[PDB]
């Protein structure tokens, strides 16, 4: 890709998301999703191989199907209220379709099958956009229509995502599939608290984006896409193993790291609503995620895996990738718990 | 009680569940067919459309 | 530290903590009523703005 | 509701089921995707026309334009898939399992 | 009766959808969609949507569906399999028609049917607007308003179409 | 001078594109310079598509005619002489 | 909107099409103009919980 | 207000002190980011790029 | 500016600097074939940059102070040990070959980076396109295991596909007995232990595989030992080539920008030369890897990124 | 010249150093000026 075209396509991705977040009209929300999808396909295809073509095709079909269901919900809403305003919907059938459409876009279980495959089939930089920026638009709609959302449906989607995301990650050695199942589990926490306190959805979303961006950036810095490739980092960039260790433990929700804060604040909100079984089940199930984060820390940081002779050649050359914002992101990924009350800025 | 809550028994369960979740054919046809089953039982068994 | 300084320092700590506990309990009660009745600034979900309505004479009279 | 809404809603469902029950040709699924859009256009036009909601008259056109541009992207991916395996069968798109 | 033309068209509309949704060869699936598109225009015409109806012919049928058929000739099929020669297509085709017929038979007899949801059967003519004598097409006034009210709609639509050109060239370069 | 010899080259080699750019340039510039552009808005305004609903006379409307042929109200004398 | 840029900048990007009782070309009214107008005015500023 | 970071009414409240303990912690986090920047690029961690 | 998209957007495009003399030329042949001499003459006559054959210490020559590093930092690969004990149990044979391929891969990137950045052509002595002949010869003599060949092809498959082939391939065909006679004349004690069978396998690999393949996409010029001495005639032939084959004709500023973005990043160049394929010859265990790396960081001007080493006289560190 | 090749950071990028110090200076001036105006407006609104 021409560097100027790449920038223009990236801005179109951003503009599609922004349109969704500033629109008060359902048609413009739908247009935002269409624009966003149109511009995201070229960055998935940018390395021109059969796996990239398969990923883009599977992505296109899933997102296109969801956008059709979103439009169907919009028209049903128009039939029963005679208006297009982006807010609660005025028909239960429209609410179910819109909720399922957005769950499909987010990749929540049991509409989750595309996320591991699409992420595996596209470059790390494209996966970073897919699993972070692309969550903003569907979540911003869910933030506005949640009063009309069926509580049983949304909590069922949340519980299944935490279970599927946790179990799916245990069997993975590919770093992009691990991140994909991590994403599915984390969307579950975001939507579980949505009916009770949407502010905690935003808090979990922002913190998730920061840690996920950190992990993808560190994977890109070393061009690692597999567990065994990542296990060579100790014999090249020892510092990077420590950063990876801390970030993974944060993503595991261990105190006193930043990734504890969203799980902690979400448990608080549901208990205030006399919801005890659900937070307890979710916290225990999230130990599945902690297990396969810990496995990565074992092979990356806490043990020294075997190396290769040709690695000595790498010792002589500096790390020249941009690694943009990594020092900032990694510090926020790990050391923000003392500043937790700052979550009220999102209110 | 021992067989129920051993480290070996809990670990095997999750390992078995993980293979159920992850052992997929990778076919567009099967994933979308599961979407159809999901939407039907959402309305027929759980009345999520109400 | 002398026993009077610790003793009266404890009272200052207790006053702050006791006041915070009372405010925490009120907030749970205030939130419960606002959400159930929608008569407060919280849980104020938007409704369509009436300044968007056109009040001029229309092409036909019955409206 | 009116009679027509029964059949128009049914047509959307039929094409949705058709889309979710893949066969072999990827083209056949793109047709079901475009059938869903057709019924959406007809359903929206009928609602907008019947209610005399004048400014919404442009909405079905905007839907048609974006959907067709969206269908163009789908056809581009189909030809790239077909250039790789010689057919557009969806059972070839299983490398990422 | 002619008073039920819209309902009759909507019945054919559904059969066309069963035609290509059972997914025969995409050559015939495309034909089923062309017929549905033409019938879809007919429905829209009878609700006063002259301009919107003709856009279906011009854009949906004369534009998008031509490219669909064009691409099918290149990348999908050149010869078609005998229509209904597959058990699955015929089963789906027969399944849809019978479901459609049972819906139509009961609504006509009762002037109302309950397929999941409640539907009337008196006729579509009953919901129509009664008084009209403006000296213009209201449907045309709304679409023309795109250029005076929808500055925002034009910009984003215009941008997306330009991006479509850029993107498709990137996708197909290889 | 540098631009003058540039135009001569395009005129000799790509006259079709030179005409296109010139015609399109005139389309974007001339409406701002034409003195008749203001009458386009006036004529469009003067065309009465919908009924002119009369006002209720409160006695404080000296500028509102009581009858169509009265001397108050917008005039189209400018349009007749146009 | 999630980010109410329109209100904050005082620019109308899409609010003009949101409801059928808004200003229309040539003052053409919708069939349910008076009904939508009445419901909007009743429900204005009290919130959807109260309005329902 | 709508889509305003600090509405005008917020100016009645006392400003945070420049010696706020939370602000010092934020400053400390910034210092840590500076060191990690040096480390990932194999610069002398403490001395390198004081301007940065 | 450091080269990147911003520099590219501002005009730094390969076609604006590449002329008709911007050619990559590689000289190939058997051992002791006088290719080093012919390569040196072509560069001088044509005004191209000459690249000596990439040996064990080629990477040492491009980093730090340019001087060769001790052997532990090269993995104890020894060309001398290869002749004396080609079947040694320490896996020296394949470890050397895997190391040598990586050195050539680095040199080819250095060559391409030079050509794309300045427009001046380069002359190489063998390359990653012809390195396999030694691998095939080693395998056919039983010096390396079959699994070693599989590892070599795995690495080659995911590296060579990124780079364009030479514009010109110059092959100097010296018959094996003549080479076997010249090796003895050269008076190298270890090299004199080579066998004709090994030399014959090297020759077979060029003619069987290399030359036919490169002909499909390169201009291939062949010479004998006598015809090779006439450098002017060889340079005359090169200047009269047509250039109508190979992928170089499909290149444009866009594609060469992506190629220049790769070859300038040496860690990205070597990314796959150390894939985690645990093969005994090239696998190093953690304790040895750990302490050798620690020793490397202690070498002069190696602890920190170049420009931040006070022990070698770098200044203004507190502003760099 | 110890290095066989000129390092990218052999000499400091003086412009970038000037920008870095300039931005830090500007931000500190803006913050203190902002803080002072917050204090004065805080006291005017509460009549201190
Ligand atoms: C309260 C909650 C908790 C705290 C929340 C805090 C949130 C984060 C705060 C913002 C953090 C910004 C990053 C800190 C600055 C570090 C970069 C630096 O100092 O280098 C000087 C920078 C370039 O230094 P460098 O040697 O090329 O590389 C520095 C890092 O490696 C460059 O590393 P990089 O590759 O990641 O560069 C990213 C940076 C690009 O780096 C820059 O260009 C510096 C921009 C700093 C912006 C200052 C933001 C704060 C002011 C807000 C208003 O991106 C930006 O532009 C940031 C906007 O010089 C300048 O450009 C001065 C600014 C001129 C305008
Ligand atoms: C707070 C989170 C901050 C996240 C910052 C992430 C910065 C990007 C990652 C830094 C690592 C280096 C880098 O710049 O990323 C590379 C990537 C560009 O792609 P690349 O492969 O490097 O080259 C393109 C040419 N084909 O760069 C990109 O494509 C940008 C993709 C990341 C943008 C989405 C970030 C998440 C959303 C942030 C919103 C926060 C709310
Ligand atoms: C304050 C409120 C917030 C509280 C939450 C806790 C915040 C702390 C987490 C901050 C984020 C992680 C950043 C940690 C900085 C690590 C830098 C460091 O200590 O040195 C790394 C070390 C240096 O390696 P290198 O520079 O490449 O070469 C050495 C030659 N002199 O690299 C090595 O030599 C590798 C050594 C082998 C790996 C050992 C792994 C065990 C030690 C890990 C310690 C960090 C664990 C972080 C978890 C939190 C701890 C409470
Ligand atoms: C410690 C934990 C707390 C740290 C939080 C730091 C977040 C960054 C500061 C932003 C503060 C802010 O004002 O944003 C809060 C805003 C409020 O959410 P909103 O939907 O607008 O309605 C609120 C009514 N309850 O909502 C948000 O801004 C949060 C949602 C972020 C979504 C990212 C969208 C990025 C779009 C950027 C477009 C421009 C490209 C850059
Ligand atoms: C919204 C409401 C939806 C409720 C239904 C939620 C369940 C959705 C299923 C998502 C998980 C998909 C993964 C999966 O189910 O594994 C495949 C599995 C087939 O494996 P099989 O051995 O045949 O069955 C053994 C079951 N005891 O199949 C199954 O076991 C099932
Ligand atoms: C609260 C602390 C949070 C972590 C702070 C961020 C870590 C910064 C320290 C660091 O990353 O560098 C470690 C550095 C390694 O030493 P050095 O020989 O200079 O090798 C670096 C080559 N550029 O070490 C140094 O020589 C610089 C001296 C500072 C080292 C600090 C060690 C950090 C250990 C954090 C462990 C978790 C603490 C709890
Ligand atoms: C993925 C499958 C997609 C298939 C989409 C099929 C189209 C669906 C059309 C839905 C439109 C009709 O939707 C349905 O209409 C009736 C008519 O008032 C509503 O009314 C019904 O439910 C509520 C319940 O209190 C009341 O209005 C009333 O008791 C009852 O008649 C339903 O609440 C509404 O859900
Ligand atoms: C009270 C809540 C407790 C929450 C606990 C947190 C969940 C942790 C999930 C771990 C599940 C997977 O853990 C996995 O278990 C199996 C045990 O069969 C191990 O597998 C090992 O044992 C099995 C047989 O026992 C062998 O066939 C296998 O070759 C061997 O590798 C895996 O090495 C381990 O990774
Ligand atoms: C006057 C305003 C009226 C509104 C006009 C509407 C805007 C239309 C924008 C079209 C922009 C096209 O811009 C056009 O780009 C090409 C780039 O190849 C330039 O042309 C250049 O590239 C071509 C390559 O094909 C070369 O053969 C040519 O020698 C070189 O000059 C033209 O000098 C420029 O006219
Ligand atoms: C890549 C994006 C390209 C976008 C290109 C946009 C080109 C736009 C060019 C012309 C736009 C405005 O075109 C024209 O400009 C003049 C400028 O006063 C306006 O003004 C003119 O008409 C009005 C109407 O009463 C008069 O009052 C005024 O005296 C007269 O000057 C016109 O009403 C407008 O029709
Ligand atoms: C990819 C490119 C992205 C670039 C984004 C640039 C943003 C463009 C902003 C367009 C909207 C500008 O702001 C909006 O313009 C239109 C026309 O001027 C105005 O609309 C005007 O025309 C009709 C006439 O009645 C009505 O909509 C309204 O009565 C009137 O105000 C709006 O009052 C104004 O709020
Ligand atoms: N095992 C192995 N040896 C190699 C490789 N490249 C060179 N060598 C050895 O390096 C030694 C010298 O290389 P040559 O250039 O071919 O011989 P030379 O006499 O020095 O050079 P010329 O006579 O000019 O051709 C030879 O013994 C080669 O076998 C290689 O890729 N693998
Ligand atoms: Mg030699």
UniProtKB/Swiss-Prot annotation, chain B:
The chain crosses the membrane at residues 26-46. Core subunit of the mitochondrial membrane respiratory chain NADH dehydrogenase (Complex I) which catalyzes electron transfer from NADH through the respiratory chain, using ubiquinone as an electron acceptor. Essential for the catalytic activity and assembly of complex I. The gene is MT-ND5. It comes from Bos taurus (Bovine). Belongs to the complex I subunit 5 family. This is NADH-ubiquinone oxidoreductase chain 5. It is found in: Mitochondrion inner membrane. Core subunit of respiratory chain NADH dehydrogenase (Complex I) which is composed of 45 different subunits.
Curated annotation (Swiss-Prot), chain C:
It comes from the Eukaryota. It is found in: Mitochondrion inner membrane. Belongs to the complex I NDUFB5 subunit family. Accessory subunit of the mitochondrial membrane respiratory chain NADH dehydrogenase (Complex I), that is believed not to be involved in catalysis. Complex I functions in the transfer of electrons from NADH to the respiratory chain. The immediate electron acceptor for the enzyme is believed to be ubiquinone. Complex I is composed of 45 different subunits. This is NADH dehydrogenase [ubiquinone] 1 beta subcomplex subunit 5, mitochondrial. The lineage of its organism: Eukaryota, Metazoa, Chordata, Craniata, Vertebrata. The chain holds residues 127 to 189 of 189 of the full protein.
Curated annotation (Swiss-Prot), chain D:
It is a multi-pass membrane protein. GO terms for cellular component: mitochondrial inner membrane; respiratory chain complex I. Its EC number is 7.1.1.2. Keywords: Electron transport, Formylation, Membrane, Mitochondrion, Mitochondrion inner membrane, NAD, Respiratory chain, Translocase, Transmembrane, Transmembrane helix, Transport, Ubiquinone. The modification N-formylmethionine is found at residue 1. GO terms for biological process: ATP synthesis coupled electron transport. It is found in: Mitochondrion inner membrane. The keyword Electron transport applies. Its main location: mitochondrion. It catalyses: a ubiquinone + NADH + 5 H(+)(in) = a ubiquinol + NAD(+) + 4 H(+)(out). Signal peptide: none annotated. InterPro entries: NADH_UbQ_OxRdtase_chain4L/K, NUOK/Mnh_C1-like. The chain crosses the membrane at residues 1-21, 29-49, 61-81. Core subunit of respiratory chain NADH dehydrogenase (Complex I) which is composed of 45 different subunits. Core subunit of the mitochondrial membrane respiratory chain NADH dehydrogenase (Complex I) which catalyzes electron transfer from NADH through the respiratory chain, using ubiquinone as an electron acceptor. Part of the enzyme membrane arm which is embedded in the lipid bilayer and involved in proton translocation. PANTHER family: NADH-UBIQUINONE OXIDOREDUCTASE CHAIN 4L (PTHR11434:SF0), NADH-UBIQUINONE OXIDOREDUCTASE SUBUNIT ND4L (PTHR11434). This is NADH-ubiquinone oxidoreductase chain 4L. It comes from Bos taurus.
Curated annotation (Swiss-Prot), chain E:
It is a multi-pass membrane protein. InterPro entries: ComplexI_Subunit6, NADH_UbQ/plastoQ_OxRdtase_su6, Nuo/plastoQ_OxRdtase_6_NuoJ. Gene3D superfamilies: NADH-ubiquinone/plastoquinone oxidoreductase chain 6, subunit NuoJ (1.20.120.1200). Its EC number is 7.1.1.2. One of its GO terms (molecular function) is NADH dehydrogenase (ubiquinone) activity. It is found in: Mitochondrion inner membrane. GO terms for cellular component: mitochondrial inner membrane; mitochondrion; respiratory chain complex I. It catalyses: a ubiquinone + NADH + 5 H(+)(in) = a ubiquinol + NAD(+) + 4 H(+)(out). The chain crosses the membrane at residues 1-21, 25-45, 47-67, 88-108, 149-169. GO terms for biological process: mitochondrial electron transport, NADH to ubiquinone; mitochondrial respiratory chain complex I assembly. Keywords: Electron transport, Membrane, Mitochondrion, Mitochondrion inner membrane, NAD, Respiratory chain, Translocase, Transmembrane, Transmembrane helix, Transport, Ubiquinone. It is an enzyme of class 7 (translocase). It comes from the Eukaryota. Belongs to the complex I subunit 6 family. Core subunit of respiratory chain NADH dehydrogenase (Complex I) which is composed of 45 different subunits. Core subunit of the mitochondrial membrane respiratory chain NADH dehydrogenase (Complex I) which catalyzes electron transfer from NADH through the respiratory chain, using ubiquinone as an electron acceptor. Essential for the catalytic activity and assembly of complex I. This is NADH-ubiquinone oxidoreductase chain 6. The gene is MT-ND6.
């Amino acid at each position: 890709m021409n560097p100027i075209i790449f920038i223009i396509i990236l801005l179109t991705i951003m503009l599609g998301t922004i349109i969704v977040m500033i629109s008060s009209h359902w048609l413009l929300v739908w247009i935002g999703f269409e624009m966003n999808m149109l511009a995201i396909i070229p960055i998935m295809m940018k390395n021109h191989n059969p796996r990239a073509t398969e990923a883009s095709t599977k992505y296109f079909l899933t997102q296109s199907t969801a956008s059709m269901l979103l439009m169907m919900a919009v028209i049903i809403n128009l039939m029963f209220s005679g208006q297009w305003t982006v807010m609660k919907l005025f028909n239960p059938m429209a609410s179910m379709l819109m909720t399922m459409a957005l769950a499909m876009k987010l990749g929540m279980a049991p509409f989750h099958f595309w996320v591991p495959e699409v992420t595996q089939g596209i470059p790390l930089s494209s996966g970073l956009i897919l699993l972070t920026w692309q969550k903003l638009a569907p979540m911003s709609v869910l933030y506005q229509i949640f009063p009309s959302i069926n509580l049983n449906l949304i909590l069922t989607l949340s519980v299944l995502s935490i279970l599927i995301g946790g179990w799916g990650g245990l069997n993975q050695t590919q770093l992009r599939k691990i991140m994909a199942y991590s994403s599915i589990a984390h969307m579950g926490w975001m939507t579980a608290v949505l009916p009770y306190n949407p502010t905690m959805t935003l808090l979990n979303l922002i913190i998730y984006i920061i840690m996920t961006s950190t992990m993808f950036t560190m994977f890109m810095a070393n061009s690692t896409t597999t567990t065994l490739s990542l296990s060579h980092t100790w014999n090249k960039t020892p510092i990077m193993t420590v950063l990876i260790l801390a970030t993974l433990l944060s993503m595991g929700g261990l105190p006193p790291l930043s990734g504890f804060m969203p799980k902690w604040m979400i448990i608080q909100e549901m208990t205030k609503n006399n919801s005890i079984i659900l937070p307890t089940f979710m916290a225990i199930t999230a130990l599945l995620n902690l297990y396969f984060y810990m496995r990565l820390t074992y092979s990356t940081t806490l043990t020294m895996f075997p190396s290769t002779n040709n690695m000595k050649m790498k010792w002589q050359f500096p790390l020249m990738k941009k690694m943009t914002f990594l020092p900032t992101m990694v510090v926020l990924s790990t050391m923000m718990l003392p500043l937790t009350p700052m979550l009220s800025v999102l209110e | 009680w021992l067989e129920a809550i051993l480290p070996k028994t809990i670990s095997l369960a999750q390992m078995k569940a993980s293979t159920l979740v992850t052992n997929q054919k990778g076919l567009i046809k099967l994933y979308f067919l599961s979407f159809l089953i999901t939407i039907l039982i959402s309305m027929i068994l759980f009345n999520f459309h109400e | 530290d002398g026993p009077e300084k610790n003793y009266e320092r404890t009272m200052a700590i207790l006053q702050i903590e006791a006041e915070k506990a009372e405010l925490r309990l009120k907030e749970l009660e205030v939130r419960r009523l606002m959400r159930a009745r929608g008569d407060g600034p919280w849980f104020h979900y938007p409704t369509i703005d009436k300044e968007l309505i056109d009040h001029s004479p229309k092409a036909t009279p019955d409206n | 509701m009116s009679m027509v809404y029964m059949n128009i809603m049914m047509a959307f469902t039929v094409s949705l089921v058709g889309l979710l029950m893949y066969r072999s040709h990827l083209m056949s699924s793109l047709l079901c995707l475009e059938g869903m859009m057709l019924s959406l256009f007809v359903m929206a036009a009928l609602t907008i026309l019947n209610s005399h909601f004048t400014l919404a008259s442009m909405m079905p056109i905007i839907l048609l334009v974006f959907a067709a541009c969206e269908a163009a992207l789908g056809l581009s991916l189909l030809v790239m898939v077909s250039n790789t395996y010689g057919t557009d069968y969806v059972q070839n798109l299983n490398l990422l399992q | 009766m002619m008073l039920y033309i819209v309902f009759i068209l909507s019945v054919i509309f559904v059969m066309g959808f069963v035609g290509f949704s059972s997914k025969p060869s995409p050559i015939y699936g495309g034909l089923g969609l062309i017929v549905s598109g033409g019938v879809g225009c007919g429905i829209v015409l009878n609700f006063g949507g002259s301009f919107l109806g003709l856009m279906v012919f011009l854009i949906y049928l004369g534009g998008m569906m031509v490219v669909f058929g064009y691409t099918t000739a290149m990348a999908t099929e050149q010869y078609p399999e005998i229509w209904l020669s597959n058990k699955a297509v015929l089963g789906a085709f027969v399944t849809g028609l019978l479901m459609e017929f049972f819906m139509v038979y009961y609504v006509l007899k009762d002037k109302e049917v309950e397929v999941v949801f409640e539907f009337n059967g008196l006729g579509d003519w009953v919901i129509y607007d009664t008084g009209d004598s403006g000296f213009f097409s209201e449907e045309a006034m709304g679409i023309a308003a795109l250029y005076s009210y929808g500055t925002w709609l034009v910009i984003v639509t215009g941008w997306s179409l330009l991006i479509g050109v850029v993107v498709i060239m990137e996708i197909t370069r290889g | 001078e540098r631009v003058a010899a540039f135009l001569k080259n395009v005129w000799a080699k790509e006259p079709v594109l030179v005409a296109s750019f010139a015609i399109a340039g005139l389309a974007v510039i001339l409406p701002t310079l034409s003195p008749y552009t203001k009458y386009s808005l006036m004529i469009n305004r003067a065309t009465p598509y919908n009924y002119p609903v009369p006002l209720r006379d409160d006695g404080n409307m000296p500028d509102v005619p009581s009858h169509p042929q009265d001397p108050q109200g917008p005039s189209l004398e400018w349009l007749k002489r146009l | 909107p999630f980010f109410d840029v329109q209100k904050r900048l005082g620019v109308d990007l899409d609010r003009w099409m949101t409801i059928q009782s808004a200003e229309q070309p040539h003052k053409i009214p919708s069939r349910c103009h008076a009904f939508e107008k009445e419901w909007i005015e009743c429900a204005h500023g009290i919130g959807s919980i109260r309005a329902e | 207000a709508t889509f305003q970071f600090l509405p005008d009414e917020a100016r009645s409240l006392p400003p945070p002190k420049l010696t706020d303990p939370r602000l010092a912690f934020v400053g400390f986090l910034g210092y840590c980011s500076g060191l990690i920047d040096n480390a990932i690029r194999r610069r002398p961690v403490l001395l390198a790029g004081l301007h940065r | 500016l450091q080269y990147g998209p911003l520099a590219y957007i501002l005009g730094e495009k390969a076609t604006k600097k590449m002329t008709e003399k911007s050619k990559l030329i590689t000289v190939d042949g058997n051992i002791c074939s006088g290719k080093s001499k012919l390569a040196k003459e072509i560069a001088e006559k044509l005004g191209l940059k000459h690249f000596p054959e990439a040996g064990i210490h080629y990477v040492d020559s491009t980093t730090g102070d340019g001087k060769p590093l001790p052997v532990q930092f090269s993995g104890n690969c020894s060309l001398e040990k290869f002749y004396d004990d080609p079947k040694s149990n320490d896996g020296n044979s394949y470890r050397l070959q895997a190391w040598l391929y990586a050195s050539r891969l680095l040199q080819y990137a250095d060559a391409l980076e030079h050509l794309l950045s300045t427009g001046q052509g380069v002359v190489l002595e063998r390359s990653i396109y012809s390195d396999f002949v030694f691998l095939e010869a080693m395998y056919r003599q039983g010096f390396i295991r079959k699994q070693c060949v599989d590892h070599y092809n795995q690495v080659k498959k995911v590296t060579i596909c990124e780079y364009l082939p030479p514009h010109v391939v110059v092959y100097v065909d010296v018959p094996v007995p003549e080479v076997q006679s010249r090796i003895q004349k050269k008076g190298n004690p270890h090299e004199m232990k080579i066998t004709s069978a090994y030399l014959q396998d090297i020759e077979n690999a060029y003619k069987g595989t290399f030359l036919p393949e490169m002909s499909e996409k390169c201009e291939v010029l062949q010479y004998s030992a006598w015809e090779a001495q006439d450098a002017e005639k060889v340079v005359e032939d090169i200047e009269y080539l047509k250039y109508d084959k190979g992928p170089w004709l499909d290149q444009n500023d866009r594609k060469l920008h992506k190629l220049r973005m790769l070859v300038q990043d040496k860690l990205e160049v070597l990314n796959y030369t150390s894939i985690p394929v645990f093969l005994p010859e090239v696998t190093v265990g953690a304790h040895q890897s750990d302490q050798v790396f620690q020793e490397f960081t202690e070498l002069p001007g190696r602890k920190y990124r170049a420009g931040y080493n006070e022990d070698v006289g770098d200044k203004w560190i507190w502003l760099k | 010249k110890f290095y066989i090749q000129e390092p990218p950071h052999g000499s400091p990028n003086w412009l970038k150093v000037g920008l870095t110090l300039g931005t830090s200076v500007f931000l500190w001036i803006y913050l203190i000026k902002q803080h002072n105006e917050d204090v004065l407006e805080y006291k005017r609104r509460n009549g201190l």
